[PDB]
A paper describes a structure:
Despite the low helix propensity of threonine, we were surprised to note the shortest d and θ between COi+1⋯COi+2 at the type-II′ β-turn in 5 with an En→π* of 0.46 kcal mol−1. An overlay of the type-II′ β-turns of both the β-branched amino acids valine and threonine revealed a clear difference in the side-chain rotamer conformation. Valine in 4 crystallized in a gauche− (g−) side-chain rotameric conformation, whereas threonine in 5 crystallized in a gauche+ (g+) conformation. From the statistical analyses of protein structures, it is known that β-branched amino acids favor the g+ side-chain conformation over g− in helices. Thus, Thr25 in the α-helix of GB1 with a g+ conformation engages in an n → π* interaction, whereas Thr11 at the i + 2 residue in loop L1 with a g− conformation lacks the n → π* interaction. Moreover, our dataset revealed that Thr with a g− conformation at the i + 2 residue in the β-turns does not engage in an n → π* interaction. Therefore, despite the low helix propensity, the n → π* interaction in threonine at the type-II′ β-turn in 5 is a result of the altered side-chain rotamer conformation. 5 with the strongest COi+1 → COi+2 n → π* interaction displayed the maximum stability (TM) and 4 with no detectable COi+1 → COi+2 n → π* interaction showed the least stability. The Ramachandran plot of the i + 2 residue in the type-II′ β-turn of 2, 3, 4, and 5 revealed that, as the strength of the n → π* interaction increases, the torsion angles of an amino acid in a non-helical region in the absence of the stabilizing intramolecular hydrogen bond are gradually altered to occupy the right-handed α-helical region.
Numbering used by the authors: 1 to 56
The structure:
C-alpha cells in the first residue's frame, strides 16, 4: 500500500511517499529518510490514512 510522510523542518517542508508491505516497514524507510535529510523531532502516525508526519 501507499504510505505518506509529511516533513516540516521549519524553513524546509515537503511530502514523500513509499510503497510498503506494512506500516512498520514504511516507518523504517521514512525514519531513515528524515535522518538523511536533517529533519529530527516529533513523530505522528495516522493508520487510517497511512500518513506519518515528522516535525523538527
Amino acid at each position: 500500500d501507499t504510505y505518506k510522510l509529511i516533513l516540516n523542518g521549519x524553513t524546509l517542508k515537503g511530502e514523500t511517499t513509499t510503497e510498503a508491505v506494512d506500516a512498520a516497514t514504511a516507518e523504517k524507510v521514512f525514519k531513515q529518510y528524515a535522518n538523511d535529510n536533517g529533519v529530527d523531532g516529533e513523530w505522528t502516525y495516522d493508520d487510517a490514512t497511512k500518513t506519518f508526519t515528522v516535525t523538527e
